[PDB]
């Protein structure tokens, strides 16, 4: 019916996220982040060339780990901010400008990474709900892909 990320979907996404997120160590975050990227790079050959600065071709590099940690931190802040849309919108604008002025990064890549997350999550999260997860992920990306090319 409606593709809107509802209040109930937000609670569900946070649950799916919590019962998979490590409060104290990054071992669990890295694994999930890297897994997603490996999946994106294998579905979008070109994409890898956008992470040259963080050593995209060296998934286990010290600097790509740092990047994955930042990606996951950013997604963590957003998912938690689903409970306070006002601030979320601000946070999502700041993420937008961070992804703008970087040729290649388009709404196409985000649709690809969404698919990557949809494949990685069920393997790591228990009771994963793809539909609820999907609606709020998109809600999140739409604020990040504001000023981007298709």
């Amino acid at each position: 019916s409606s593709n809107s990320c509802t209040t109930e979907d937000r609670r569900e996404m946070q649950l799916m996220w919590a019962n998979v997120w490590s409060a104290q160590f990054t071992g669990r975050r890295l694994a999930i982040a890297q897994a997603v990227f490996k999946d994106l790079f294998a579905h979008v050959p070109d994409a890898v060339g956008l992470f040259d600065r963080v050593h995209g071709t060296e998934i286990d590099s010290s600097e790509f780990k740092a990047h994955c940690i930042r990606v996951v931190n950013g997604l963590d802040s957003a998912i938690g901010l689903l409970s306070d849309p006002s601030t979320l919108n601000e946070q999502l604008s700041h993420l937008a400008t961070q992804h703008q002025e970087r040729a290649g990064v388009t709404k196409g890549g985000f649709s690809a990474i969404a698919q990557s997350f949809l494949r990685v999550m069920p393997q790591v999260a228990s009771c994963f709900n793809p539909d609820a997860w999907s609606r709020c992920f998109n809600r999140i990306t739409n604020g990040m892909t504001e000023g981007l090319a298709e």
């Binding site: 802040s77 409970s83 006002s86 946070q91």
Partner: protein
């Protein structure tokens, strides 16, 4: 005191409690910054882009959200030196051009400590571990 292996495990767990999953993050971040600008109002001039004049705004709250995310990332890496430094280096870049005094870093350091202690209670707050490990983190942010 030194930010040793043990102190690092301590800080990690205490931080996990204080920071938590997400429901208490807004208040945690508020408490911290209300303390910063109270003790050092002059610091506000540096946050004109994110409404440093009013920390009740969504714009600043988003900022406070990024800062905490910054600490979370570092604390989460206090046991992975190699990756911790790469990260501390990134944060260093994000600040390198803003002219942050060693005094302000200390103020934000104390804000954060009072905030965590306020979050988990004076009863368990490990002052030494926190002071030694936060300075390790600030040092990284300032190049060194």
């Amino acid at each position: 005191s030194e930010c040793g292996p043990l102190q690092r495990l301590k800080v990690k767990r205490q931080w996990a409690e204080a920071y938590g999953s997400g429901n208490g993050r807004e208040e945690f971040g508020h408490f911290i910054w209300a303390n910063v600008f109270k003790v050092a109002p002059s610091a506000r001039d540096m946050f004109k882009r994110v409404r440093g004049d009013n920390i009740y705004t969504p714009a600043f709250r988003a900022h406070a959200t990024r800062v905490l995310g910054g600490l979370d990332m570092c604390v989460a890496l206090l046991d992975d030196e190699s990756v911790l430094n790469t990260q501390l280096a990134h944060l260093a870049s994000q600040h390198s051009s803003r002219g942050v005094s060693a005094e302000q870093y200390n103020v934000v350091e104390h804000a954060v400590m009072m905030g965590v202690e306020h979050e988990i209670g004076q009863n368990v707050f490990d002052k030494d571990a926190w002071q030694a490990c936060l300075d390790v983190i600030t040092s990284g942010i300032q190049g060194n």
